[PDB]
PDB file of C-alpha atoms in Angstrom:
ATOM      1  CA  UNK A   6      -6.865 -20.165  13.075  1.00 13.99           C
ATOM      2  CA  UNK A   7      -4.539 -17.616  13.301  1.00 13.98           C
ATOM      3  CA  UNK A   8      -2.881 -18.172  10.085  1.00 16.67           C
ATOM      4  CA  UNK A   9      -6.464 -17.735   8.421  1.00 18.57           C
ATOM      5  CA  UNK A  10      -7.137 -14.692  10.454  1.00 20.55           C
ATOM      6  CA  UNK A  11      -3.725 -12.937   9.100  1.00 16.58           C
ATOM      7  CA  UNK A  12      -4.635 -14.114   5.727  1.00 17.26           C
ATOM      8  CA  UNK A  13      -8.027 -12.493   5.732  1.00 15.42           C
ATOM      9  CA  UNK A  14      -6.417  -9.400   7.014  1.00 14.53           C
ATOM     10  CA  UNK A  15      -4.126  -9.391   4.015  1.00 16.62           C
ATOM     11  CA  UNK A  16      -6.950  -9.674   1.750  1.00 15.76           C
ATOM     12  CA  UNK A  17      -8.467  -6.562   3.188  1.00 14.31           C
ATOM     13  CA  UNK A  18      -5.224  -4.913   2.921  1.00 15.41           C
ATOM     14  CA  UNK A  19      -4.925  -5.637  -0.930  1.00 15.10           C
ATOM     15  CA  UNK A  20      -8.419  -4.254  -1.169  1.00 14.38           C
ATOM     16  CA  UNK A  21      -6.824  -1.137   0.267  1.00 14.90           C
ATOM     17  CA  UNK A  22      -4.294  -1.543  -2.613  1.00 15.67           C
ATOM     18  CA  UNK A  23      -6.768  -1.967  -5.135  1.00 13.05           C
ATOM     19  CA  UNK A  24      -8.375   1.371  -3.936  1.00 12.85           C
ATOM     20  CA  UNK A  25      -5.055   3.180  -4.142  1.00 11.69           C
ATOM     21  CA  UNK A  26      -4.222   1.634  -7.334  1.00 11.18           C
ATOM     22  CA  UNK A  27      -7.472   2.936  -8.703  1.00 12.33           C
ATOM     23  CA  UNK A  28      -6.901   6.201  -7.389  1.00 11.19           C
ATOM     24  CA  UNK A  29      -3.361   6.558  -8.710  1.00 11.49           C
ATOM     25  CA  UNK A  30      -4.369   5.611 -12.120  1.00 10.07           C
ATOM     26  CA  UNK A  31      -7.695   7.690 -12.480  1.00 12.09           C
ATOM     27  CA  UNK A  32      -5.926  10.814 -11.154  1.00 13.86           C
ATOM     28  CA  UNK A  33      -3.164  12.712 -12.859  1.00 13.91           C
ATOM     29  CA  UNK A  34       0.197  13.038 -11.083  1.00 16.14           C
ATOM     30  CA  UNK A  35       0.900  16.685 -12.241  1.00 12.21           C
ATOM     31  CA  UNK A  36      -2.856  17.890 -11.770  1.00 10.28           C
ATOM     32  CA  UNK A  37      -3.584  16.077  -8.617  1.00  9.90           C
ATOM     33  CA  UNK A  38      -5.556  18.067  -6.291  1.00 10.45           C
ATOM     34  CA  UNK A  39      -4.250  19.208  -2.678  1.00  9.74           C
ATOM     35  CA  UNK A  40      -7.407  17.211  -1.441  1.00 10.21           C
ATOM     36  CA  UNK A  41      -6.758  14.369  -3.544  1.00 11.67           C
ATOM     37  CA  UNK A  42      -3.171  14.184  -2.394  1.00  9.97           C
ATOM     38  CA  UNK A  43      -4.545  14.538   0.987  1.00  8.00           C
ATOM     39  CA  UNK A  44      -6.478  11.251   0.660  1.00 12.66           C
ATOM     40  CA  UNK A  45      -3.872   9.536  -1.131  1.00 13.16           C
ATOM     41  CA  UNK A  46      -1.319  10.633   1.896  1.00 19.09           C
ATOM     42  CA  UNK A  47      -4.065   9.404   4.640  1.00 18.22           C
ATOM     43  CA  UNK A  48      -4.436   5.964   2.926  1.00 20.53           C
ATOM     44  CA  UNK A  49      -0.591   5.694   2.197  1.00 19.23           C
ATOM     45  CA  UNK A  50      -0.275   5.943   6.029  1.00 16.83           C
ATOM     46  CA  UNK A  51      -2.604   3.190   6.626  1.00 15.35           C
ATOM     47  CA  UNK A  52      -0.500   0.994   4.058  1.00 12.88           C
ATOM     48  CA  UNK A  53       2.733   2.070   5.542  1.00 10.44           C
ATOM     49  CA  UNK A  54       1.366   0.888   9.024  1.00 12.68           C
ATOM     50  CA  UNK A  55       0.095  -2.317   7.232  1.00 11.00           C
ATOM     51  CA  UNK A  56       3.438  -2.690   5.492  1.00  9.85           C
ATOM     52  CA  UNK A  57       5.055  -2.769   9.286  1.00  8.88           C
ATOM     53  CA  UNK A  58       2.325  -5.090  10.103  1.00  8.90           C
ATOM     54  CA  UNK A  59       3.445  -7.492   7.045  1.00 11.36           C
ATOM     55  CA  UNK A  60       7.170  -6.901   7.997  1.00 10.84           C
ATOM     56  CA  UNK A  61       6.568  -8.243  11.446  1.00 14.04           C
ATOM     57  CA  UNK A  62       4.806 -11.342  10.173  1.00 14.07           C
ATOM     58  CA  UNK A  63       7.034 -12.519   7.473  1.00 13.86           C
ATOM     59  CA  UNK A  64       9.793 -13.765   9.910  1.00 14.19           C
ATOM     60  CA  UNK A  65       7.365 -14.778  12.348  1.00 12.03           C
ATOM     61  CA  UNK A  66       5.170 -17.002   9.731  1.00 13.39           C
ATOM     62  CA  UNK A  67       6.680 -20.336   8.882  1.00 13.48           C
ATOM     63  CA  UNK A  68       3.652 -21.201   6.879  1.00 14.75           C
ATOM     64  CA  UNK A  69       4.483 -20.970   2.962  1.00 14.32           C
ATOM     65  CA  UNK A  70       1.325 -20.044   2.127  1.00 13.80           C
ATOM     66  CA  UNK A  71       0.785 -16.969   4.361  1.00 11.25           C
ATOM     67  CA  UNK A  72       4.538 -15.974   4.174  1.00  9.02           C
ATOM     68  CA  UNK A  73       3.703 -15.995   0.261  1.00 10.90           C
ATOM     69  CA  UNK A  74       0.875 -13.760   0.969  1.00  9.94           C
ATOM     70  CA  UNK A  75       2.760 -11.569   3.105  1.00  9.79           C
ATOM     71  CA  UNK A  76       5.602 -11.169   0.547  1.00 11.25           C
ATOM     72  CA  UNK A  77       3.236 -10.119  -2.038  1.00 10.24           C
ATOM     73  CA  UNK A  78       1.385  -7.756  -0.090  1.00 13.08           C
ATOM     74  CA  UNK A  79       4.538  -6.225   1.043  1.00 12.46           C
ATOM     75  CA  UNK A  80       5.294  -5.570  -2.661  1.00 10.13           C
ATOM     76  CA  UNK A  81       2.141  -4.234  -3.509  1.00 11.07           C
ATOM     77  CA  UNK A  82       2.385  -1.698  -0.711  1.00 14.32           C
ATOM     78  CA  UNK A  83       5.700  -0.644  -2.021  1.00 14.60           C
ATOM     79  CA  UNK A  84       4.308   0.099  -5.559  1.00 15.52           C
ATOM     80  CA  UNK A  85       1.348   2.133  -3.752  1.00 16.41           C
ATOM     81  CA  UNK A  86       4.092   4.161  -1.680  1.00 18.62           C
ATOM     82  CA  UNK A  87       6.263   4.707  -4.691  1.00 19.86           C
ATOM     83  CA  UNK A  88       3.256   5.417  -6.885  1.00 20.96           C
ATOM     84  CA  UNK A  89       2.074   7.928  -4.369  1.00 21.34           C
ATOM     85  CA  UNK A  90       5.901   9.551  -4.156  1.00 19.53           C
ATOM     86  CA  UNK A  91       5.693   9.918  -7.783  1.00 16.32           C
ATOM     87  CA  UNK A  92       2.345  11.707  -7.589  1.00 16.45           C
ATOM     88  CA  UNK A  93       3.868  14.252  -5.078  1.00 16.23           C
ATOM     89  CA  UNK A  94       7.039  14.851  -7.240  1.00 18.33           C
ATOM     90  CA  UNK A  95       4.807  15.512 -10.425  1.00 18.15           C
ATOM     91  CA  UNK A  96       2.466  17.831  -8.619  1.00 15.76           C
ATOM     92  CA  UNK A  97       5.440  19.945  -6.975  1.00 16.92           C
ATOM     93  CA  UNK A  98       7.783  19.255 -10.270  1.00 13.21           C
ATOM     94  CA  UNK A  99      10.591  17.920  -8.234  1.00 15.21           C
ATOM     95  CA  UNK A 100      10.726  14.554 -10.048  1.00 14.83           C
TER      96      UNK A 100
END
């Protein structure tokens, strides 16, 4: 029950990762608009909240499948975080 529910949540989080990936690919780091970075920032904050959620579960989930999904989502959220950071650095010229 709860395992399937958590997996479903991770799928929704992966969806959010896909949204960020799309924006962080289609947009230009050096030409990113303040509004675009604001939207990315808010979504990044959500991803960070979901990252903490994952981190809480990893050690608490013995299930190999769900734990695998947790680790995968964690890595994806880290990629989104760092990619967003790159956007900020490139736009401000502090890379």
